Structures are given as structure tokens and as C-alpha cells.
Amino acid sequence: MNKVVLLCRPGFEKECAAEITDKAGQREIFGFARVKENAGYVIYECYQPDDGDKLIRELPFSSLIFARQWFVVGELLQHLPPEDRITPIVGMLQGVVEKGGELRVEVADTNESKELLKFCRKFTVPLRAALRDAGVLANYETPKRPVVHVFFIAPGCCYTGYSYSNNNSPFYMGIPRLKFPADAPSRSTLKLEEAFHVFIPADEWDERLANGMWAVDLGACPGGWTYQLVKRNMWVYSVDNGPMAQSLMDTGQVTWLREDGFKFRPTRSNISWMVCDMVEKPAKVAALMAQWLVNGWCRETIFNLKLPMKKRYEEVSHNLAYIQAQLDEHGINAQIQARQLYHDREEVTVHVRRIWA
Amino acid sequence: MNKVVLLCRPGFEKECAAEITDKAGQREIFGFARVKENAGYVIYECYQPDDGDKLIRELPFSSLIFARQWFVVGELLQHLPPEDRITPIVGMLQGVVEKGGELRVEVADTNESKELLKFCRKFTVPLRAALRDAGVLANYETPKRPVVHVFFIAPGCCYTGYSYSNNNSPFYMGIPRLKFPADAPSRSTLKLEEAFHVFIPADEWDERLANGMWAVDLGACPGGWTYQLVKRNMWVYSVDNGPMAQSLMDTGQVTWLREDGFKFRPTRSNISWMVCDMVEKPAKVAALMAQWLVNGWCRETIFNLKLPMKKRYEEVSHNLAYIQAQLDEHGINAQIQARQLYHDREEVTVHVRRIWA
Ligand SMILES: C[S@@+](CC[C@H](N)C(=O)[O-])C[C@H]1O[C@@H](n2cnc3c(N)ncnc32)[C@H](O)[C@@H]1O
């Protein structure tokens, strides 16, 4: 199988396509990706017949910025008859996957696929039972078998294939399912919350997003990001000239510092987390983030970088290489990830974990 | 997992070890193999932690001469308590293999493991049921999941691991199960029969060992090899100065040519199969085989090469490279395999399939 599907934000197919061509190219896994404006996905077609499975094994999924999720697929099934919906899909997956761990029937995140989404979520149930009988799915859900994807690009038109659970998005359509909490001060709270789900493996949450940690939130007003930190039982220095929500102040966990996030110097030495959602030039925000990490003012950080109008993939990769250059220059070991989150529009979210010897 | 177990003929551990070190070395999969004189197996210990699974994926199993079978294993389980035999083995395989396709509980092919063999064949049944409940084995047998191996080197001492069904021996202990037929003229009939099982994939038998084919058997007296060809409903020219068994002559399928296999020139142009089990110097037999293939006197061939006293792996590889050199020199495309069959002692059996454009 030579085709790899990447789900992306509608209208970012060109970046998603530029990135995967670039990063697969770097491993001599050559091919091309067409771009269908606003389709909400991109297909990378490898030149070599089995390079598709090589690509989704060896290139780290966490290193792609503009893909929400990916999977290898086979040939496009067209015109699935309403009266015979199961057989053709089973025929495409048999011998392709044996005893898979999970099924996900997905669409592109466009408005035109909204009805089709409802169909897919319900179709999952009877389809899963049938794929079980055929031995394509294990009788029990399993983390350590590939996820089976059936991907509908239009009614009666779908691809079938898979991805490895240790190298993909754990989430449906690459979008964690989050309800907005009415007591949170801003909708942007879901950016940090989503970021927690995307970047920190769920079984490490109690350890890395730990009850009792100090955190700093730069540009905190009115407190959407602070809220997520408070929900984790952290103590927070919220840094802004604007006021913090009273609901947050009442918890007893928030210290409001009336300052400029860009000018703020932490007096404290044991801050675990710094988060920053300040609206400003990407090169400047990146510079600030590098200061924090190089000085060991925080152990981990989540922040946002706004994208330019053109050369978005190139520009944001430049920003990241700046921060990495600053780390190398001072001999500092860190892991860096960036992802255009579902709740990110013309921006990218970044996570950096610094290490001490 | 860095350890790969290779089953071999007892007393050929040094060759088996020389070969795997050489061929894994060629792929920069470095490590070492200790040699326990007559143990009937060899363990290749890779330097890199996960190179074990790389080795049994990427190096073609069909290219090893002195291994009957191989599989990756983990740590040696010692002292399996009679009162608790299942739990420790399940604990070693869980997370290591999920929904495996098949179970094989094997020992080394030594006389000291004869009682242990009987234990292993019976233990398979309750062990398989338990591994199913734990999700280590699928509830149904499957070709397209890895084979799960539990390997006993002494009572209560075993390794656990796996191999890929598309890159291993399909046979238990790498030994196809054959009963000797009383109407066959020689016990050596089982060499050719075993060779058919080892070299020709079972689903290609009716096509490649086809009813109606012409074959030539050089050094045919008294007719053990001829017998296997006759059993496939082939027409056979049995070439020898010694007499063919009357039982064979009565079938109507055997033409006895009173000649020297080394001097014999086929008058016929459409011989599918030539087989040769003539006792003679390996370089000379090889030369004869190269004549047959280069002149297109047969489409496929199975023959035997006797091993020298020392440098057996080196010597027999030399012979094979001679034949390959002769093919290259005349622009001839062929696939070559050689395996020290179970019914081979101080010799190796070879199969060559020639191709026409
Ligand atoms: C888009 S809001 C997001 C706030 C937060 N993420 C939330 O959910 O409530 C960004 C905040 O950063 C603050 N900000 C932007 N630039 C700043 C600067 N240079 N110094 C201090 N605050 C700044 C703004 O006042 C604003 O309150």
C-alpha cells in the first residue's frame, strides 16, 4: 500500500502536503501529494508499492505539525450500494489487517461532511461487528493492534486502511472530544485542554500535570488557560495587566501579577509549567520561550505561535529551529512538538519538555 | 528483544553460528553467537536491543542453509514449578505478542530431549487454551499472525518468543512430518520428499510438481527419488547403471536408462524436473548442475552436495557461488536455495528454479 491519508484543517492542505513531502523525502520515501483546496485531507502517494506502511511506521507521527491524524489506505471504494454495504468493505480489509484492535469510521472535518459524519458514527457499530466475524477486528478492543480506519470522502465512497496505535493520534479524526465548561472565563480554555490531550500521554497526566505544581500563565487575562491549570490542582501565577476572573481568584490557587508577560521575571525557582498565549510576532514569542527554557525558569511549556500569510510551514519551522538552536548553543536537552490543534486557526501550538541531568 | 534462536542439526552449531553471524553482519545487525557443542540450537545475541525483531523480518529465512527454523526470544525462564506452569509463561508473552496465529512448543532435536518432546507436544494443548484466554493467541488459528514459540532447553527451562509465518519454517521444529512408505525402494526417498516440503510452497505443488511432467533422476538406483516423482504422477527417466525397483517399472511411468548420470545428455527438450543424489565431489556435482541449468535441460532441480570435514559453511557457499557465477556468465535468471534437511547428515540439499523470459 502506497497511499497515506493525512487529516488536516480545511484550507491547510498545501502546508500539510508541503510538510509530508519534505519529511518523507528526508527519509528517501519519495512520492507526491495532490492538493484539493479545503478538502480537509491530503493523500501522499509513495512511488514504491509498500512504502506506505514504511512511512507510517518510521516517520514519528508526533513530528508532523499540520496533520491531525494519518493512516495508510488502499484503493478508493466507489458507489457502496445501500443494499450491500458490508461485503465490499470487508473484502477490501481481509488479508490487509488481521485481528485489528479498534475501528474508526471517519470523515473530513468539513461542513459538507457533517451529515456523512452522523452516518459514520452510527455505521461504526454494525460495521465493527461484521469486521469481527470476518477476523479483521479482534473480538475485544486492544491498544496493541493497529487501528482500522474506514474513511468516507463522500457518501458511498470510502478508503480503508490502518495506523499504528504507538504512532498516530489516539483521537477520533485527530480531535479530542471536549465539552466547554460554563464556569471557564474564555473559550480559549479548550486550546490548552486540547494541547494537554495531544502532547502529554494520558497515563502520564497525574505525574506531569500533577496536583500541587507551580505554573505561570503569561497573558492570562481573563483566565481560560489558567482555568485548565487550576483544574489540575496547580498553583498559578497569572500574569497580565488585565483582570483575572473572580471565579478563578476565589479558588485560592491564583496569584494575579499585574505585569507584561514579555517583561516578567519569575522570582521563584521551582516552576514546573509555563504556558503562554500572548498575541505577538512569532519570532518574538519564540525568543521569549527560549529565554524561559535556557534559564530553566520552567520544566515544561505550552505556547502558541501565530502563522504568517504565506510560507506558513517554512516560517513556523524556522521559529522552531530558532528555539532548538538556542538550546543547542547552551547544551540543553529538550523534546519539542508542535501541532495545529483543532481549536487553532491561523496558529500552531507548541510543547517543550526540558531535561535536567 | 535481541536474541534469535536457530534450530539446527546437533553437531552443526558452529556452521549455523558462522552463517548467521556472517549474514546478519552483512546487514550491520551485529552481535555474537556462542556455540554449545551438540546442543542442537544456536542463539544469536544482537548488540542493539530491538535488532532481534529486525533480523527475523529482514534477512530472508530461505537464505540460511544450516537453520531448520528460527525465532526471536526473550529472557530464559528457569525453574517452571510443576504446580504453577501457566502463569509465568503467560507473563512472559503478554504485551510481547497480541492475538498470535499459532503455538508451537518445541525442543532441540537431541536424544536427551526426547522425553521433553513428549511433554511439549501435550503441553501445547492446555497452554494454547490459556494463551487464548490471555489474548496472546487468537481464538482461531491464523496464517497471517506470528507463530508463537515456547522453546524448552531443559525441563522447567524455556524461552518464549515468535517468528513471522511469511519468513520462517512452516514446520514443527523445522522438520516436516513424514512417514516412510513401505513400497518405496530406499529410505532416501524422504530426502526428496522433505525437499519438496521445504522448497516448494504447498499451494504451488499442483502447479510446480505437476501431474504429467517429465523428470530426470540421475543416479536413480534403486529408486527412492524416482518414487517421489512417480507419486506426483510424473514421467521419469531414471538414469543409472544399477537396476530400478520392479515396483517402479510396473507403474508404466519409469524409463530406465543404463548410463552414467555424469555422462548423460537428455535428447528430450521439455524436461521440467531434474533431480540428482549422486555421491561425488561437491565441486563436480555443482559443475554438472550448472551444465543442466545453463543449457536449459531442466526448468527446476533438486540435488545434494556432500560437505567436507572442515570449513563446511565456507565450502558449500563456494559451490553455490560457482553455480551462480556460471548463471551470471550466461545471463540466466534463477532462484537458489539450500538447506541442510532433517534427513541430510554430512550434506546439504539444494533447489534451483530457472526462469525463461
Ligand atoms: C488572546 S488573550 C488569551 C488569554 C488566555 N489564553 C485566556 O484564555 O484567557 C491574550 C492575553 O495576553 C495579553 N497580552 C498580550 N501581549 C501582552 C504583553 N506584551 N504583556 C502582557 N500581556 C499581554 C492580553 O492582554 C490578553 O489578555
Ligand SMILES: C[S@@+](CC[C@H](N)C(=O)[O-])C[C@H]1O[C@@H](n2cnc3c(N)ncnc32)[C@H](O)[C@@H]1O
Ligand atoms: C546413494 S545412491 C541414491 C539413489 C537414489 N537417490 C535412491 O534413493 O535410490 C546414488 C546412486 O548414484 C549412482 N551413481 C553414483 N555415481 C554415478 C555416476 N558417476 N554415474 C552413474 N551413476 C552414479 C550409484 O550407482 C547409486 O545408485
